[PDB]
Design a protein around this nucleic acid. Structure first.
Ligand SMILES: [Mg+2]
Ligand SMILES: [Mg+2]
Ligand SMILES: [Mg+2]
Ligand SMILES: [Mg+2]
Ligand SMILES: [Mg+2]
Ligand SMILES: [Mg+2]
Ligand SMILES: [Mg+2]
Ligand SMILES: [Mg+2]
Ligand SMILES: [Mg+2]
Ligand SMILES: [Mg+2]
Lengths: 271, 188, 76, 115, 57, 135
RNA sequence: ACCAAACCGAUGCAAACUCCGAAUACCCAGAAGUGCCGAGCAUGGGAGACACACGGCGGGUGCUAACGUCCGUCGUGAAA
RNA sequence: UCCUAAAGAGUAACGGAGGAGUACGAAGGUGCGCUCAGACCGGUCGGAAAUCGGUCGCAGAGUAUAAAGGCAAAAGCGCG
RNA sequence: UGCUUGACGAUCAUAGAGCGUUGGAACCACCUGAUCCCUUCCCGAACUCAGAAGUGAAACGACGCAUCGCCGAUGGUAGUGUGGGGUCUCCCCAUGUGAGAGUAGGUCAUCGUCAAGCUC
């Protein structure tokens, strides 16, 4: 006997060790083992199948069924569900979605690595595309001369935003080697999912998007790039190369454990 | 040592060049520890007197941007090479407790009567000047006194010879080097 | 003593930049000593000539150690 | 050390050629006491099946023998076939393919799994 | 809204690019006023040919 | 006169002399210096003529630094030779000077003795040179 | 009492030197309008040309001389 | 082969600098194993240096052949 | 919902170099003699084999400590597309773009899958 070195309580340590060993034993497969076309057996829940007194796989409580997987999608930070070709799902869903933890075995593996199933695009996805963002500067024209350069409001907002003959807005283009950004969070979210340089890198990693955006705000380069064009919003006019350099420099330091994020989500929804 | 400034809410090359010929101003920045950098305009005449002052470089200078007052130290001077005149300053804020590296001139106060001068051939060459410094702003070394009245002919003065008084360190001595300061040799 | 005798300009360079669509056996880069290394779906033939093997879009990404340039083609 | 980075230097040739070929890799890690074995997908960073001696059903104090490695190579094939994994490549991980590594490889073939 | 441009310079000594930008805007000769939709790519040619045009609003 | 002991190549292009002198415009060793406020180039004999003028007006001590070193060889075809039969041989070496460049430095002398010595030095050069102090 | 590798510090210069590095120029994809009503491509009939000159911006040679000579890129004349 | 050649190709001069009109039956193919140059200390006739041991190295060596571009999956070295 | 450790990876100096205390619970080499395979341009250290009679430091393993290296702002400057000028081998103006170097300072990195140990 040696005293375990842990900050957790004794009973909590027992529970953690027991759950870890049970997860390793009862659930020996993950998202890795399911390329497209892979035939796998899945142990469904008590619904639609009978409880069995005689069980063959480790910790099998229900009957299994053999089927083929099209891919895998993520229903959580560390939780993944496999998409099958059978359409029932005990509902009107076009394809079933079952947690990969329910898998008990695989008979044949499809070619290639595990395939991320491409769910059908929703109108929300089309409306919230990367290119749907505002493209060029939109400045107000309250005084006489027509604006030709993009400038901050510079306290014109503070003393006069209610009295005006009309709030004429003129669209002014920017230099081709710059980005115009209205929402930093949305721009950095659509980026790292659709940009080519950052497209397929983060399938395995989870990034702290909010912390990354706050750090990007704290970076004095983007601070210099800030331009105030409206009263209650801040837009950025930053060179493409500078933005990409800053993003590449800051990004790898803002990764977090998927398991910890999943546990935080579980404790949040449970409470 | 006192100086008033402005905001300079206009950046770039043409905007920076128009200030020098039209208004005779000089841009600048105020970057520090706990605050963001702030661009600043200044008058060439006002900077000229401070530059003409001897110990103005190694001294805390109050800066009046608007009504805002701040203790500002100068540790940079961009200067036009061809004609010769001050360009944008790039001076630094002074926090009450910070290491605050800067540059300090030398004087070589006592060289009228020296051993190598009066006894042997008399020549004194000041190899280095504007020695760096690293000390808190609570005590400002305006200058460092060097005495060469006892150094004989053929001897040289290292950085370790002269002393940095009252809690002042030398970055060059923190490095693995000890530079010569002055020499006494024979005239050709 | 006398020095003329120039060479005939082998027509090197890089074709099919990183926003293109490539066929099975297109020539990507005419190179001279591996300025760019073999990415995912390129071959690096006899004279270090990068050529595609599958269809996709050229990438031009820097990967791995030594700061080497890799020319990969992405099926997108 | 001197040995560790030398064997890593030796292994990386085949370990990178298999990555280019996009083949499921059967890695191995020999020790002075007991041998491991892993099956890794065609991305270099994802393990599909793995049989080792330190499980709670094979540690008996006799590990570190050619006979012990035969059992590991036998019991890795059943877990590989449980994942439906065939058409794999054998990465010796810089170890000279003469002894216990060869026995593990032969037991992998005897276990139904084929390269 | 729209913006009217007026050609106030000749096209007979200019580059092959600005001479194409003016034609793309749709101007045929000097003192010729046309209405163009003030799109981000229509006013981009006005920037290239700013010295040939009188943007009178 | 001053020239490299050995050179990687024998002849060089004509080139151009654009821009100011941002490096070399600060006095480093001496206390007084003679910087050039006009663009041009020195031919490696003007440097010697100015050096011998500065080193004979003091005649007591001080120290002299030659900041500019000629390293650009220039060609010159001989007379009665038609153009286009190769490239001429190297006759002399040239230093390229652009505004702000410091040419000479002096220390250990009076603030006015050096001023009237650099007056002698400037008369031997084709450039309009000003007098600057250490800072 | 000369000289002197090596190392440290300060300080300058290279078309055939780079720890770096633009602006422009180039390619590919998506769009509104314009194109004198077509701008592109391919197959055929007919050709003419293959001594070029000067101006601006970048270079080689020349003496960063020549309305000098050879190039890259635009304009004019040639042919207004 | 480099520059001139102006950060896609190309681009002239009786413009600046260099080489080729071959070699290998292993100097090719495969499997398995190993580091280079250079500095210092010690070690008998060698001595700044030959062959040997150790450390510091972190490719500043080497490429069959001129220069340019690459070579720790070494494209360099040895054995069947 | 912890700590330790092995394997393969994401990314390649903000991930590196250098400076202590340490790990017995599996590995990590070391070791008995090299008998049985295998090995030495000669060597049981490289390589291999029967483990653990021994060993926890040299060795490595992570785990402390910001001198060096690396990263690097803002601002200005150099340069430059378009148009017009001057004292036109060079520079200026309007507009757009805009380096390199230097300049407060962070860091003993941040993550993915499998496997094992500590409590039971
Ligand atoms: Mg090898
Ligand atoms: Mg015409
Ligand atoms: Mg160059
Ligand atoms: Mg002809
Ligand atoms: Mg002809
Ligand atoms: Mg002519
Ligand atoms: Mg004719
Ligand atoms: Mg070219
Ligand atoms: Mg070009
Ligand atoms: Mg060879």
């Amino acid at each position: 006997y040696r005293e375990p070195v842990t900050r957790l309580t004794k009973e909590k340590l027992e529970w953690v060790i027991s759950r870890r060993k049970e997860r390793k034993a009862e659930q020996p497969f993950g998202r890795a083992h399911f390329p497209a076309g892979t035939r796998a057996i899945f142990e469904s829940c008590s619904l639609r199948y009978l409880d069995e007194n005689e069980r063959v796989y480790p910790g099998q409580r229900y009957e299994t069924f053999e089927a083929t997987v099209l891919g895998v999608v993520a229903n959580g930070h560390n939780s993944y569900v496999a998409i099958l070709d059978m359409p029932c799902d005990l509902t009107e869903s076009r394809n079933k979605a079952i947690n990969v933890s329910w898998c008990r075995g695989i008979v044949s593996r499809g070619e290639g690595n595990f395939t991320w199933f491409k769910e059908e695009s929703t109108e929300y996805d089309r409306n919230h595309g990367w290119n749907i963002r505002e493209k060029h500067p939109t400045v107000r024209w309250a005084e006489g001369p027509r604006p030709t350069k993009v400038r901050s409001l510079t306290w014109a907002e503070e003393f006069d935003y209610n009295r005006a003959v009309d709030p004429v807005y003129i669209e002014i283009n920017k230099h081709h080697s710059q980005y115009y950004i209205t929402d930093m969070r949305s721009f950095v979210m659509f980026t790292l999912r659709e940009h080519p340089a950052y497209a397929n890198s983060f399938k395995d990693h989870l990034h702290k998007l909010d912390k990354l955006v706050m750090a990007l705000y704290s970076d004095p380069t983007i601070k210099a790039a800030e331009v105030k064009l409206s009263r209650y919003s801040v837009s950025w006019l930053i060179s493409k190369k500078k933005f990409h350099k800053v993003l590449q420099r800051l990004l790898p330091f803002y990764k977090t454990s998927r398991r910890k994020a999943q546990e935080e989500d579980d404790k949040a929804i449970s409470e | 040592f006192i100086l008033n400034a402005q905001v300079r809410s206009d950046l770039g090359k043409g905007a920076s060049r128009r200030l020098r010929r039209n208004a005779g101003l000089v841009p600048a920045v105020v970057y520090g520890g706990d605050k963001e950098p702030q661009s600043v305009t200044l008058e060439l005449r006002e900077i000229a007197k401070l530059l003409e002052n001897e110990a103005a470089f190694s001294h805390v200078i109050a800066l009046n941007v608007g009504g805002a007052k701040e203790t500002v130290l100068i540790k940079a001077l961009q200067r036009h090479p061809a004609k010769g005149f001050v360009m944008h300053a790039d001076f630094l804020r002074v926090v009450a407790d910070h290491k605050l590296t800067a540059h300090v001139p030398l004087h070589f106060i006592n060289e009228e009567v020296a051993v190598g001068v009066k006894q042997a051939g008399g020549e004194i060459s000041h190899t280095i000047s504007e020695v760096e410094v690293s000390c808190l702003p609570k005590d400002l070394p305006e200058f460092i006194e060097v005495d060469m009245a006892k150094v004989e002919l053929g001897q040289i003065v290292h950085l370790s010879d002269l002393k940095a008084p009252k809690g002042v360190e030398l970055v060059q001595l923190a490095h693995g080097n000890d530079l010569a300061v002055a020499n006494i040799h024979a005239s050709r | 003593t006398r020095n003329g005798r120039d060479s005939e300009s082998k027509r090197l360079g890089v074709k099919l930049f990183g926003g293109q669509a490539v066929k099975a056996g297109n020539i990507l880069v005419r190179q001279r000593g591996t300025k760019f290394h073999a990415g995912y779906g390129v071959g690096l033939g006899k004279d270090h000539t990068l050529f595609a093997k599958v269809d996709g879009v050229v990438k031009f990404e820097t990967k791995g150690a030594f700061g080497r340039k890799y020319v990969s083609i992405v099926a997108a | 050390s001197v040995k560790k980075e030398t064997r890593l230097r030796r292994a990386r040739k085949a370990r990178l050629k298999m990555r280019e070929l996009e083949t499921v890799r059967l890695c191995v890690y020999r020790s002075s006491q007991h041998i491991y074995a892993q099956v890794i997908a065609a991305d270099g960073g994802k393990v599909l099946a793995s049989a080792s001696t330190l499980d709670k059903d094979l540690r008996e104090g006799a590990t570190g023998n050619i006979d012990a490695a035969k059992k590991v190579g036998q019991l890795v094939a059943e877990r590989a076939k449980a994942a439906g994994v065939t058409q794999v490549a054998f990465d010796r991980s810089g170890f000279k393919y003469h002894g216990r590594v060869k026995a593990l490889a032969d037991a992998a073939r005897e276990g139904g799994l084929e390269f | 809204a729209t913006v009217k441009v007026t050609l106030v310079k000749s096209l007979n000594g200019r580059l092959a690019n600005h001479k194409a930008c003016v034609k793309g805007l749709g101007l045929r000769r000097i003192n010729h006023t046309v209405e163009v939709q003030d799109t981000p790519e229509n006013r981009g040619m006005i920037n290239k040919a700013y010295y040939l045009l009188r943007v009178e609003g | 006169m001053l020239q490299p002991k050995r050179t990687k190549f024998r002849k060089q292009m004509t080139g151009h002399n654009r821009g100011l002198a941002h490096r070399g415009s600060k006095v480093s060793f001496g206390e007084y210096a003679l910087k050039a406020t006009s663009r041009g180039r020195l031919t490696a004999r003007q440097i010697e003529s100015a050096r011998r003028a500065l080193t004979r007006h003091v005649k007591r001590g001080g120290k002299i630094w030659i900041r500019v070193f000629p390293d650009k060889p220039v060609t010159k075809k001989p007379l009665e030779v038609r153009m286009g039969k190769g490239k001429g041989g190297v006759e002399y070496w040239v230093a390229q000077i652009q505004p702000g460049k410091v040419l000479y430095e002096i220390e250990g002398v009076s603030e006015e003795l050096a001023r009237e010595a650099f007056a002698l030095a400037a008369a031997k050069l084709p450039l309009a040179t000003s007098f600057v102090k250490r800072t």
